[PDB]
Design a protein around this ligand. Structure first.
Ligand code: MG
Lengths: 100, 220, 50, 50, 50, 50, 92, 50, 434, 126, 46, 46
């Protein structure tokens, strides 16, 4: 029902993504059909690129400077995926105004 | 406990699935432990004679002694082997899956004043305990681990799905319980273990390649 | 689709699950929005008026 | 959208760049006919005898 | 899928107290804005990076 | 255009009033450089008299 | 191999120290667990040991009362000195 | 994006990325501090009681 | 910004204790300690003993596939050096007993507290004995204790506490695993705590403990702020916190997606550059400017496997107390006592007061990111007699360094020789092959 | 049961005060109290009183203004003043300074209750 | 899905206990421990 | 620093580096440790 991300309105009132029917679970499979994929255990980055001080971690003094500016840059990177083993266990029914 | 008497066996380290361990080098510290073995039909009745129905003895008897889905669908991935899933073996042996899992039991912490002396006492009671008002009983409700078990034999037999009767209880924790399975991993600093065979396996692979060149020099 | 029809949806949740799923294993919970349920309600209303 | 993606389980992968899973069908099959021939090697047409 | 984010701030914002003329808010994950009473600026940046 | 699209976006979907929202920030696997940014807000107030 | 045990005794000497203080810290940790309504500590402690807790000094460390967790060479001679005195008191 | 009462002189404001001190002043979160112990009397020899 | 610890106890509220934990989660993974090394440096020394050879730690890299024509076989010749010294320690005798340091020094404050004990035993035998039926046998039990002295009754209790729990926990194995961790990184750390009503002891993973604010001290007890991250099971957090976790907090544990199961997640501070290389799961950097590779440096994800993440923060805050000079009623002796800040001074009797700021050991715990639990002043204040400010936490250990440096471990002085063994045993495995 | 106790870390730690709740008033409870002990023998208490070292702080009385600026009490009742003298000692049952700070503060409210009970007794008989 | 363990003792009926086993069925294929090696690695060792 | 395995190149030669690579720096081999560690192990047994 979200009007922020779904932007095409439907002529019968309300957004057009809300008129979509989806049957996500059909029967018993003996395993997860839909699960979240994740590498070596969640693995994430928390880099820091700061000059003479770090406002993020609250640190004055740098023995090994990144640059000479009066700054701090944070970098965060993560790898992630979703899996559907059996897509025939899921049935969709979509309005055609969303264009395929 | 089987046959009324306590036993002790070794768990095959290929036939156990230790779930939810907390970087512990132990096996009692697991929240869930699955034991999957293949049992003789004598061992499934030496263990569960008193709880099996005549419906389920029929399943142990009238198995074909060399399983099909509800709508007659043959399960085509029963006929492949790697270089479980198969309720009865081709040696007349039944799949025995045993799930042990720590559930959650609601209990009450009850503060009682002693009748004779003016000293408070603490006890723990299950959640069906009605509190004794008009006597100062104050009650607070906690949640607490409780070791449960269950057993499946083949695909249709479901036996001993109940709270585990050997609660390995401690005196102060109502929540410290584990299963019968006790063991340890021989590792170093929360890692996967580097065994003695693993530290000699690169040298045994080098022996076979040089005893190969030796044998082809002997032959020629 | 443009016009919803429940005669197709019962004929399309069944043909993939006809003799492959059991009789107790056919509960089909449809996830949709607030306006999809009214499009569903007005078409169950047209079946039960037939 | 976050509580939609929380009902789905997790699986640790050993890195790598892609995953494969193997799907299997049935061993039983009916085979179409090309043509039948009688004893003397000629084919059986539609407008033929038994 | 591999994703990445980045924020850059000036160095003087290490202990930068907020003399709140209007009340300083945090965006919730639900879309709402919630009024906050904290006065340091990097408490509000590090909310929004996650 | 991502998604492997080769034939392009139709020109009737690049008009005035087309709303653009933030999905994510995909980066290359080897030797990526920093992308993404972080977005803030501030509230209002009202008044009355006697 | 004694003079090769001299080379690695610098590891054991600090390790025997950490085993002292990890038991000095555990003894203070066990001392607080007595005053926490624990029915186990009436089984591992005697009559007179379960009464020390009521004196108003059980909150401080035992190093301030003249007690240390000592595995040294003097306390192993004293442990033997009370044993060979015990058997020599048994006869006669 | 308009007004809810008559005297809603403030509007909802937003920005992206690097925030300076100037972004913290345009949203009315920076004010000059008052050194309360600092108080001066302009030096004179007052003769009003003379 | 860490919140101000120079406050009265009424201003150490629910949100102030929660703000101390949100700081330890968010900011600090700093690993800037003067006498101890970095977590990727210790982890390499552990990985060398599990037989994993990092090619980024013996050359500049120019692979990641598990095959010998571009990787290097490892030959574990450092394990058998270290397994003698952890084998000798297990065969040394372990008799750690409490002793009186001066057993022939009995005083009057000692002898008063013995007479308080023998009176308090005498009240019990009058109440329990039902009219002289066992009053004579209960008196025969404590006629032995007329010969016992107060430094002996304190020692008999202090040995009975150790003699049980050494024999129960197999404490000689907790220590023997620690001496193996003493020879790879040079850090041996033990945590003693009350868990489940009983005292427990655990060794702390030196890759999973952050020691802040110490003064080139080899002792871990001297630190001001210790953060312990680990991945606990949901069963272990209910064994420990059955007593303080709201029913809402149980539904946080009970609404977890499923299971997954040393790549927790990596932080790099002081990054010179933006160019990071990863698709298998480890992060590759600039060749000499940076680490050049990332071996996990932190425990960022709030749940791995089904295991939850339990962050425990122990910190020394400041407590205002009072020093009160009061005269003895009977004789003219000025006596000094220590009272907290809520004690009102009895004037008109000579009580002179001065206010001191004094360390207090606090603790707090978050399980995951929604549970915030046991945020309180630490109930085992490791107290000293004349010092109100001298305390520590349960965490006790030592760094095996020389003169306030970082520890040159036994693996660290054998790792350059073991890298060269792998270099020359690769020329041998290619000479045999050809 | 959260009344004057620190039930944390698997154990039951108290600071000496006995917070007495959930029984009922002396008129409303059928057993005319909670009857915590057999010492007189019917030691009766109600929903508001607190006990420290067998001394009962009454919840039905009030605090006189003369005995408030003297002894520096904070609560409106003597029980609700002894519920405010142990607020520091609630989270710290084994602190040696807090046990000394509690017992020194508990004798003041014990003194001030005997002063207010004497003033109420002397005025009514006069 | 593993059914809810935060229940009272009365709602842990026969079909609830049968749901925990049918969840546990076919879970012996995978590996779930951070301090164990894989079953395809220990069968090489034996 | 020699006993901690740090070599300073400004003490064994005039240098004409700050990149820690054996093709320009020197690998130190800590052989003065076990000479001193006997004598500190004999202090602990007097
Ligand atoms: Mg006993």
């Amino acid at each position: 029902d979200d009007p922020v991300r779904n932007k095409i309105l439907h002529p019968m009132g309300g957004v057009a993504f809300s008129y979509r029917y989806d049957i996500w679970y059909i029967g018993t499979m003996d395993q997860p059909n839909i699960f979240k994929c994740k590498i070596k255990g969640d693995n994430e980055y928390r880099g820091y690129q700061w000059g003479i001080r770090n406002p993020f971690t609250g640190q004055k003094g740098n023995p090994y400077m990144s640059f000479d500016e009066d700054s701090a840059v944070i970098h965060r990177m993560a790898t992630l995926g979703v899996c559907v083993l059996d897509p025939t266990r899921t049935m969709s029914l979509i309005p055609a105004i969303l264009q395929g | 406990i089987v046959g009324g008497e306590p036993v002790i066996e070794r768990v095959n380290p290929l036939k156990i699935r230790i779930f939810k361990s907390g970087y512990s080098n132990k096996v009692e510290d697991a929240d869930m432990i699955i034991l999957e073995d293949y049992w003789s039909p004598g061992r499934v009745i030496d263990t569960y004679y008193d709880v099996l129905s005549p419906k389920d003895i029929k399943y142990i008897e009238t198995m074909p002694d060399y399983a099909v889905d509800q709508m007659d669908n043959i399960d085509e991935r029963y006929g492949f082997v790697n270089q479980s899933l198969l309720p009865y073996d081709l040696a007349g042996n039944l799949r025995v899956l045993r799930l042990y899992w720590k559930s959650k039991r609601k209990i009450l912490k009850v503060k009682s004043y002693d009748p004779e002396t003016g000293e408070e006492e603490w006890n723990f009671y299950p959640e069906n305990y009605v509190v004794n008002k008009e006597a100062g009983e104050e009650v607070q409700s906690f949640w607490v681990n409780e070791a449960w078990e269950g057993t499946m034999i083949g695909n249709e037999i479901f036996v001993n799905m109940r709270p585990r009767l050997i609660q390995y209880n401690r005196l102060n924790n109502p929540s410290r319980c584990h299963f019968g399975i006790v063991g340890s991993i021989y590792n170093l600093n929360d890692s996967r273990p580097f065994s003695l065979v693993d530290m000699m396996k690169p040298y045994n692979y080098l022996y076979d390649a040089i005893h190969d060149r030796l044998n082809k020099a002997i032959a020629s | 689709y443009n016009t919803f029809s429940l005669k197709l949806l019962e004929d399309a949740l069944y043909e993939l699950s006809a003799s492959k799923l059991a009789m107790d294993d056919r509960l089909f919970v449809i996830k949709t929005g607030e306006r999809g349920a009214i499009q569903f309600h007005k078409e169950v209303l047209k079946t039960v008026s037939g | 959208l976050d509580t939609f993606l929380n009902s789905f389980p997790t699986r640790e992968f050993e890195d790598d760049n892609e995953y494969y899973w193997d799907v299997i069908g049935s061993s039983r099959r009916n085979i179409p006919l090309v043509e039948a021939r009688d004893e003397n090697g000629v084919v059986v047409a539609a407008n033929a005898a038994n | 899928t591999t994703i990445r984010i980045q924020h850059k701030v000036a160095g003087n914002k290490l202990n930068k107290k907020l003399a709140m003329g209007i009340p300083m808010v945090r965006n919730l994950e639900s879309g709402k804005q919630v009024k906050d009473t904290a006065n340091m600026w990097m408490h509000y940046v590090d909310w929004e990076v996650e | 255009l991502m998604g492997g699209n080769t034939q392009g976006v139709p020109a009737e979907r690049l008009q005035q009033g087309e709303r653009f929202s933030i999905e994510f920030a995909p980066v290359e696997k080897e030797l990526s450089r920093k992308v993404g940014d972080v977005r803030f807000t501030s509230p209002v107030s009202m008044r009355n008299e006697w | 191999t004694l003079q090769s045990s001299h080379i690695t005794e610098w590891l054991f000497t600090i390790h025997d120290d950490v085993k002292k203080r990890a038991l000095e810290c555990f003894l203070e940790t066990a001392k607080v667990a007595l005053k926490g309504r624990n029915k186990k500590f009436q089984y591992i402690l005697s009559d007179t040991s379960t009464r020390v807790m009521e004196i108003d000094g059980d909150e401080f460390a035992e190093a301030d009362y003249g007690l240390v967790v000592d595995n040294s060479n003097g306390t192993q001679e004293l442990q033997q000195k009370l044993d060979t005195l015990a058997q020599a008191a048994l006869q006669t | 994006a308009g007004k809810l009462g008559k005297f809603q002189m403030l509007g909802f404001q937003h920005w992206k990325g690097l925030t300076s001190d100037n972004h913290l002043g345009a949203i009315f979160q920076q004010a000059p501090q008052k050194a309360t112990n600092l108080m001066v009397q302009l030096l004179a020899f007052y003769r009003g009681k003379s | 910004n860490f919140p101000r610890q120079m406050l009265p106890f009424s201003k150490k509220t629910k949100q102030w204790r929660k703000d101390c934990l949100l700081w330890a989660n968010q900011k600090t993974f700093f690993n800037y300690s003067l006498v101890r090394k970095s977590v990727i440096h210790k982890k390499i020394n552990y990985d060398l003993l599990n037989g994993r050879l990092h090619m980024s730690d013996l050359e500049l890299v120019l692979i990641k596939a598990a095959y010998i024509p571009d990787r290097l076989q490892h030959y574990p010749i450092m394990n058998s050096k270290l397994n003698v010294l952890r084998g000798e320690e297990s065969k040394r005798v372990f008799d750690f007993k409490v002793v009186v340091t001066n057993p022939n020094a009995i005083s009057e404050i000692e002898d008063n507290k013995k007479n308080e004990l023998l009176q308090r035993l005498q009240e019990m035998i009058t109440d329990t004995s039902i009219s002289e039926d066992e009053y004579n046998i209960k008196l025969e039990k404590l006629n032995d204790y007329y010969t016992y002295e107060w430094q002996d009754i304190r020692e008999v209790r202090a040995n009975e506490l150790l003699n049980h729990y050494i024999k129960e926990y197999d404490i000689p194995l907790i220590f023997n695993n620690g001496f193996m961790d003493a020879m790879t990184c040079g850090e041996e750390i033990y945590q003693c705590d009350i868990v489940g009503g009983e005292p427990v002891i655990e060794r702390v993973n030196p890759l999973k403990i952050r020691i802040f604010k110490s003064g080139y001290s080899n002792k871990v007890e001297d630190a001001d702020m210790i953060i312990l991250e680990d991945y606990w099971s949901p069963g272990r957090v209910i064994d420990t916190y059955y007593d303080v976790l709201s029913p809402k907090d149980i539904k946080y544990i009970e609404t977890m997606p499923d299971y997954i199961g040393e790549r927790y997640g990596f932080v790099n501070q002081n990054m010179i550059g933006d160019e990071i290389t990863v698709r298998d799961g480890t992060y590759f950097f600039d060749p000499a400017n940076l680490f050049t590779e990332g071996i996990a440096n932190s425990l960022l994800p709030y749940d791995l496997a089904g295991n939850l993440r339990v962050l425990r923060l122990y910190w020394k805050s400041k407590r205002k107390i009072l020093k009160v000079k009061s005269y003895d009623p009977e004789t003219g002796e000025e006596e000094w006592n220590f009272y907290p800040e809520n004690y009102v001074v009895n004037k008109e009797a000579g009580e002179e007061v001065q206010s001191f700021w004094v360390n207090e050991a606090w603790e707090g715990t978050m399980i995951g990111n929604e549970i915030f639990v046991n945020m309180r002043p630490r109930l085992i204040q490791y107290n000293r007699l004349n010092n109100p400010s001298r305390c520590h936490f349960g965490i006790v250990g030592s760094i095996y360094n020389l003169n306030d440096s970082r520890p040159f471990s036994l693996v660290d002085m054998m790792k350059p020789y073991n890298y060269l063994y792998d270099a020359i045993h690769d020329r041998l495995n290619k000479a045999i092959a050809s | 049961a959260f009344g004057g106790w620190l039930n944390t870390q698997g154990g039951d730690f108290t600071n000496g005060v006995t917070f007495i709740n959930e029984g009922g008033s002396h008129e409303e409870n059928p057993y005319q109290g909670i009857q915590i002990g057999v010492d007189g023998a019917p030691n009766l208490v109600e929903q508001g009183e607190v006990v420290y070292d067998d001394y009962v702080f009454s919840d039905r009385m009030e605090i006189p203004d003369d005995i408030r600026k003297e002894y520096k009490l904070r609560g409106k009742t003597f029980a609700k003043a002894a519920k405010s003298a142990q607020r520091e000692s609630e989270e710290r049952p084994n602190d040696p300074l807090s046990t000394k700070g509690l017992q020194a503060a508990m004798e003041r409210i014990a003194t001030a209750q005997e002063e207010a009970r004497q003033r109420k007794e002397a005025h009514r008989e006069g």
